[PDB]
């Protein structure tokens, strides 16, 4: 039985440990969960599961495990009651260089002081060039992942990618530069699969995402306040905090579930566990878990308290899910 660690700083994660453990034991999978902390997690562990991370904790974990991007997945909108967005087969991708490095924003002609200024300028040149190369590499990683995702997705002859780009700050400038570079550079998988990439503004992008997310397949956002806002918008539109399954990739894959302070819906974390099991190979067990979730939401309809419609407790909901699985 493998030992996949499981970071949980809060009582919510501490109880969801036992919850997901009961679920997994009823699902009969040959793996196990090891309670750890975000600051003492063990390296050389590629596939992981986790809980709602704070911003600083996401930055720390990304710097630890070499992460570059965060993906979302709103599959639970089909299960949401009175669903305004059934079968929301799109994906949002957000870069992470702000959380990984918040400080990225930042004499009479004697033969001595000018030399000192030259050396200081060389030092700052080296530093800023390294940081700029790292940011450019993270942005290239995000964009390459989004392109590979748009290509891997079942193309409806449209394959649309929206990219938020409020003109201004250095992050947006870099993002414009790398989008231009990739587009004018590769263009071949893009033009062959007919992947229509479009940089747009926030005020012109998020209403499109709201009204018609059918016209879009992939969304890309930098680590600005605007990108965080669009990500939280999608995280809510997928069924509220708790229902969407978040993911974090780079040099290693970890799964998460978004949740505010007062929320307790673990369906995002259950979908995260299912995605993890599909990644490792236990697709039958992931399908069992998904069928159990669907049975909980449709046959018994035992919805959690925070959600509209029916109302029930976290632990009773997890008991229903486990009994449905087994």
């Amino acid at each position: 039985a493998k030992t996949i660690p499981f970071v949980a700083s809060t009582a919510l994660g501490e109880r969801l440990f036992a919850g997901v453990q009961k679920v997994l034991a009823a699902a009969k999978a040959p793996v196990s969960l090891v309670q750890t902390d975000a600051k003492f997690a063990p390296a050389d562990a590629k596939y992981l599961l986790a809980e709602p991370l704070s911003a600083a904790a996401t930055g720390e974990l990304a710097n630890k495990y070499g992460l570059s991007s965060k993906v979302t997945s709103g599959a639970a909108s089909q299960f949401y009651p009175n669903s305004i967005y059934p079968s929301l087969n799109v994906e949002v991708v957000q870069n992470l260089y702000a959380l990984s490095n918040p400080a990225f924003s930042s004499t009479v002609k004697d033969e001595s002081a000018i030399k000192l200024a030259e050396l200081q300028k060389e030092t700052e040149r080296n530093i800023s060039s390294f940081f700029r190369d790292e940011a450019n590499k993270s942005v290239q990683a995000t964009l390459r992942l989004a392109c590979d995702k748009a290509i891997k997705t079942k193309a409806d002859k449209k394959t649309v990618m929206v990219v938020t780009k409020p003109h201004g700050d250095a992050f947006d400038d870099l993002l414009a530069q790398v989008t231009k570079s990739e587009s004018d550079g590769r263009a071949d998988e893009l033009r062959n699969s007919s992947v229509s990439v479009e940089p747009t503004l926030v005020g012109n992008a998020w209403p499109k995402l709201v009204m018609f997310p059918e016209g879009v397949n992939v969304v890309v956002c930098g680590p600005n306040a605007s990108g965080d806002q669009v990500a939280q918008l999608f995280v809510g539109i997928a069924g509220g905090t708790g229902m969407v399954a978040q993911q974090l990739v780079g040099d290693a894959v970890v799964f998460t579930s978004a949740n505010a302070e007062d929320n307790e819906n673990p369906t995002g974390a259950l979908l995260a566990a299912s995605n993890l099991l599909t990644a490792l190979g236990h697709e039958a067990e992931a399908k069992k878990i998904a069928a159990a979730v669907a049975k909980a939401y449709t046959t018994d309809r035992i919805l959690p308290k925070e959600l509209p419609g029916g109302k029930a407790d976290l632990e009773a909901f997890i008991d229903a899910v486990a009994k449905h699985a087994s």
């Binding site: 499109k208 995280v235 505010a260 929320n263 419609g309």
Partner: protein, 157 residues
């Protein structure tokens, strides 16, 4: 009439983009239109668009129209209020209760701010009423509704 409603149906269903770098919004659409949006839209649908095509596509068209109407009703709110102050984080069904909660809470906070800055509870309440009435008048919002809201916040304080 029929022309503008067909343009509206095309914009809602997404078969057409609007004739500039402009977004679709309740404000940015009802401003063009005559402020009889939903009633005349549904009436024109049921009159001239439903009986033409078969019931099979008619059901899905009515469905999609209700979805897009709800989505524009959600679009009415601002992005910052939606995300940061937590109007949407629970969900569409809870947008209304969360808006009411945020409104009452921010009203109580503004009232406490005015009383801490000025004291003189009568003066503070008067200034709060003036501010609320002016913001309602600027947001095209009923003055009776604003006065009732202000009295409600004062009672709940």
């Amino acid at each position: 009439d029929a022309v503008k409603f067909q343009t509206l149906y095309n914009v809602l269903t997404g078969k057409q983009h609007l004739k500039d770098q402009v977004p679709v919004k309740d404000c940015n659409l009802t401003a063009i239109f005559g402020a009889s949006w939903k009633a005349d839209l549904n009436k024109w649908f049921d009159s001239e668009y439903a009986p033409k095509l078969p019931a099979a596509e008619r059901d899905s068209a009515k469905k999609s129209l209700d979805l897009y109407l709800k989505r524009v009703d959600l679009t009415r709110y601002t992005r910052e209020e939606l995300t940061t102050y937590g109007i949407l984080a629970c969900g569409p069904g809870k947008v209304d209760a969360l808006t009411e909660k945020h409104l009452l809470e921010t009203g109580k906070a503004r009232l406490e701010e005015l009383t801490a800055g000025l004291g003189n509870k009568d003066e503070g309440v008067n200034a709060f009423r003036k501010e609320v009435e002016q913001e309602g008048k600027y947001a095209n919002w009923p003055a009776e509704k604003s006065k009732a809201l202000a009295d409600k916040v004062i009672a709940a304080s």
